[PDB]
Write a protein that binds this ligand. Structure first.
Ligand SMILES: Nc1ncnc2c1ncn2[C@@H]1O[C@H](COP(=O)(O)OP(=O)(O)OC[C@H]2O[C@H](O)[C@H](O)[C@@H]2O)[C@@H](O)[C@H]1O
Ligand SMILES: NC(=O)[C@H]1CCCc2c1[nH]c1ccc(Cl)cc21
Ligand SMILES: [Zn+2]
Length: 273
């Protein structure tokens, strides 16, 4: 059984040099964005004011087509621009500056990976992005910034060509994943370390990606709980660092001897922000 120290030593040695990283909503709870499924604070448990047929409806296309207002009220609360990356996002950024990041796959739409300074070429926004938007009727694309003012002013954005409702290019639940996600079949066989942070690993095909790396590759989970294939299909090189994601990342960072360089980077990026 590998320890968190063994993993850090592998990384220090550059024995793991092509790190694939998978993240979900749990990496942004420290930034003030709720996840979905946490008791008490998760988005699922706080949607009564929207009077939905069931919680998941607010992120579903058929419901959106019936009544887009609940989605847009929520999106205004979640819209990028003032939330900041936290230590989790900066740790990933530091992996990238150290040339260790092969690819970062995120289920999040908050854009915080890009903000923390990871290049677009290193990211797969598997659930899309507010950076672009599409008419749901005529399919006309728009710059995501085109709908910002309406969303902030509590207006549903409308297509100036056909008047159809414009939606950010977010992947609503059970909608087709973006063409960029097709890189998973190139990246996962090349990974020599898989790091999984802040995701329940409930939602497919994303969760089965943990199984797509080589059996010899360590899979390090940094999360509140042991989840998904790491609970139900453990492999002998799995490591679990269970607890708050920021403390878990800081523990790894210290074992890496990167504490000072992180402190340095976070201070620098905060200033730029
Ligand atoms: N501060 C924290 N520290 C450690 N773990 C945390 C923290 N906060 C949350 N967690 C864990 O973080 C995990 C968050 O799990 P989920 O809420 O399902 O979010 P997702 O991103 O995996 O999947 C949501 C996909 O499902 C929807 O369809 C959308 O498409 C989403 O993209 C839980 O294990 C929490 O214990
Ligand atoms: N932090 C996040 O970006 C998370 C939590 C905020 C809402 C959200 C996230 N992921 C999503 C993926 C699809 C859709 Cl429709 C919504 C979300
Ligand atoms: Zn249109």
């Amino acid at each position: 059984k590998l320890s968190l120290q063994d993993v850090a030593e592998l990384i220090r040695a550059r024995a793991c040099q092509r790190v694939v990283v998978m993240v979900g909503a749990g990496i942004s709870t420290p930034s003030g964005i709720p996840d979905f499924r946490s008791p008490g604070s998760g988005l699922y448990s706080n949607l009564q004011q929207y009077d939905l047929p069931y919680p998941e409806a607010i992120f579903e296309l058929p419901f959106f087509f019936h009544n887009p207002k609940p989605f847009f009220t929520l999106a205004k609360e979640l819209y990028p621009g003032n939330y900041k990356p936290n230590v989790t996002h900066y740790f990933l950024r530091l992996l990238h500056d150290k040339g260790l990041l092969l690819r970062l796959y995120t289920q999040n739409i908050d854009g915080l990976e890009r903000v923390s300074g990871i290049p677009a070429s290193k990211l797969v926004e598997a659930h899309g992005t507010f950076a672009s938007a599409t008419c749901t009727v005529c399919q006309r694309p728009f710059p995501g910034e085109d709908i910002r003012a309406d969303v902030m002013a509590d207006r549903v954005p409308r297509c100036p060509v056909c008047t159809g409702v414009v939606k950010p290019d977010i992947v609503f639940f059970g909608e087709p994943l973006p063409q960029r996600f097709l890189l998973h079949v190139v990246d996962f066989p090349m990974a020599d370390l898989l790091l999984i942070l802040g995701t329940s690993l409930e939602v497919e095909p994303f969760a089965s990606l943990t199984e797509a790396v080589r059996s010899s590759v360590p899979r390090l989970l940094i999360n509140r709980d042991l989840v998904g294939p790491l609970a139900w299909h453990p492999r002998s090189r799995d490591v679990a660092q269970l607890g708050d994601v920021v403390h878990g990342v800081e523990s790894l960072v210290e074992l890496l001897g990167w504490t000072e360089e992180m402190r340095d980077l976070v201070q620098r990026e905060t200033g730029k922000l």
